[PDB]
């Protein structure tokens, strides 16, 4: 086509979605991790994670307001990944890298799994 | 902080939100324009438009599944702006620029109003 494109549009949209999350506006699901609860928007979770995409396209699960993750999932690793989904920023540290990679593998967040693998390989 | 950032994350999120719109997945509102209906996600509409932000933060309107726009709004101008919201691409043409700018002013999409004003000024 003959479209023009606004370079900062996608980043501005994600920044606003994160502002709605902060203020708990139109959040439609609670993710439960080892008795730690995280409110979010189903569509953002689906846009970022192969696991949530599969969950919320399922005819029965699409209607659930509460999703319980596998008990092996670490709440801090989940929190870091939820922050990444809404900001593009990943708080990757020596002390959390193993939990973050394990959570990203479970959530099916391929780009995060990739950078964790590379950061672990650099330290060996 | 000491975060790393994935450059393409925001664009990938918006691309996936547009794929959900195309497949009519988790769309939660119908926007009615001069008897033309457009399905969308409330959160994306709020993230892009000052008007939708005001509508869906209102305690009564946040619960509506149908929103009727002012009868002066042109369905084609709305369609072009809805496409921009989900893609960052604006199909601005000599034949639609007036309707697009009028719709962007009503929707409170300041960056679109800005480029329309500049494109109109170049033609005078």
């Amino acid at each position: 086509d003959s479209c023009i494109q606004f370079t900062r549009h996608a980043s501005d949209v994600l920044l606003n979605l994160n502002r709605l999350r902060s203020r708990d506006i139109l959040t439609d699901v609670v993710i439960v991790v080892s008795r730690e609860q995280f409110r979010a928007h189903k569509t953002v979770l689906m846009a970022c994670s192969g696991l949530f995409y599969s969950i919320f396209t399922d005819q029965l699960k699409c209607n659930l307001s509460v999703i319980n993750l596998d008990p092996e999932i670490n709440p801090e690793g989940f929190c870091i990944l939820l922050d990444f989904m809404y900001t593009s920023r990943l708080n990757l540290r020596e002390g959390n890298i193993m939990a973050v990679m394990a959570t990203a593998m479970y959530l099916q967040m391929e780009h995060v799994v990739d950078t964790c693998r590379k950061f672990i390989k650099a330290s060996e | 902080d000491s975060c790393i950032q994935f450059t393409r994350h925001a664009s990938d999120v918006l691309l996936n939100l547009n794929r959900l719109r195309s497949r009519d997945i988790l769309t939660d509102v119908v926007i009615v324009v001069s008897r033309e209906q457009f399905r969308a996600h409330k959160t994306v509409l709020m993230a892009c438009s000052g008007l939708f932000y005001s509508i869906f933060t209102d305690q009564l309107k946040c619960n509506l599944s149908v929103i009727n726009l002012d009868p002066e709004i042109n369905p084609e101008g709305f369609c072009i702006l809805l496409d921009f919201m989900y893609t960052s691409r604006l199909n601005l043409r000599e034949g639609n620029i007036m309707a697009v700018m009028a719709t962007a002013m009503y929707l409170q999409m300041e960056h679109v109003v800005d480029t329309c004003r500049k494109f109109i000024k170049a033609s005078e």
Binding site: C3, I4, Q5, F6, T7 | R89, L90, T115
Partner: peptide
């Protein structure tokens, strides 16, 4: 704004 840019030409994509």
């Amino acid at each position: 704004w840019v030409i994509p």
